[PDB]
């Protein structure tokens, strides 16, 4: 027998406030 | 001959009051301050 483990979700922040402001700032 | 004195004054003042440009004019901070980069940093 083997156990099936579900490991919860750990994430790093992708955007700053829903947006990535580096690219937005370039284009702006 | 008061016109000759005036021409001399003009030649002197054109050299004296001429503004420097794209050169040793080097500015301090508060002139070369980027508002965009500070706004991004603070964001």
UniProtKB/Swiss-Prot annotation, chain A:
It is found in: Nucleus. It comes from the Eukaryota. The prion domain (PrD) is a Gln/Asn (Q/N)-rich domain, which is unstructured in its native, soluble form, and which forms a parallel in-register beta-sheet in its amyloid form. The first 37 residues of this domain are sufficient for aggregation, propagation, and transmission of the [SWI+] prion. Belongs to the SWI1 family. [SWI+] is the prion form of SWI1. [SWI+] is the result of a conformational change of the cellular SWI1 protein that becomes self-propagating and infectious. This conformational change generates a form of SWI1 that assembles into amyloid fibrils. [SWI+]-aggregates sequester soluble SWI1, resulting in reduced growth on carbon sources other than glucose, reminiscent of a partial loss of function of the SWI/SNF chromatin-remodeling complex. [SWI+] can be cured by GdnHCl and by deletion of the molecular chaperone HSP104, which is required for [SWI+] propagation. Present with 92 molecules/cell in log phase SD medium. Involved in transcriptional activation. Component of the SWI/SNF complex, an ATP-dependent chromatin remodeling complex, which is required for the positive and negative regulation of gene expression of a large number of genes. It changes chromatin structure by altering DNA-histone contacts within a nucleosome, leading eventually to a change in nucleosome position, thus facilitating or repressing binding of gene-specific transcription factors. Component of the SWI/SNF global transcription activator complex. The 1.14 MDa SWI/SNF complex is composed of 11 different subunits: one copy each of SWI1, SNF2/SWI2, SNF5, SNF12/SWP73, ARP7/SWP61, ARP9/SWP59; two copies each of SWI3, SNF6, SNF11, SWP82; and three copies of TAF14/SWP29. This is SWI/SNF chromatin-remodeling complex subunit SWI1. It comes from Saccharomyces cerevisiae (strain ATCC 204508 / S288c). The chain holds residues 659 to 686 of 1314 of the full protein.
Curated annotation (Swiss-Prot), chain B:
It is found in: Nucleus. Coiled coil: none annotated. It comes from the Eukaryota. Involved in transcriptional activation. Component of the SWI/SNF complex, an ATP-dependent chromatin remodeling complex, which is required for the positive and negative regulation of gene expression of a large number of genes. It changes chromatin structure by altering DNA-histone contacts within a nucleosome, leading eventually to a change in nucleosome position, thus facilitating or repressing binding of gene-specific transcription factors. Component of the SWI/SNF global transcription activator complex. The 1.14 MDa SWI/SNF complex is composed of 11 different subunits: one copy each of SWI1, SNF2/SWI2, SNF5, SNF12/SWP73, ARP7/SWP61, ARP9/SWP59; two copies each of SWI3, SNF6, SNF11, SWP82; and three copies of TAF14/SWP29. Present with 2900 molecules/cell in log phase SD medium. This is Transcription regulatory protein SNF6. The lineage of its organism: Eukaryota, Fungi, Dikarya, Ascomycota, Saccharomycotina.
């Amino acid at each position: 027998s083997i156990v099936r483990n579900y490991k919860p979700l750990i994430n790093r922040l992708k955007h700053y406030n829903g947006y990535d402001i580096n690219y937005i700032s370039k284009i702006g | 001959a008061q016109q000759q004195l005036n021409k001399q004054r003009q030649d002197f003042e054109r050299v004296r009051l001429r503004p420097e440009q794209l050169s040793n004019i080097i500015h301090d901070e508060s002139d070369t301050i980027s508002f965009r980069s500070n706004l991004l940093k603070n964001f």
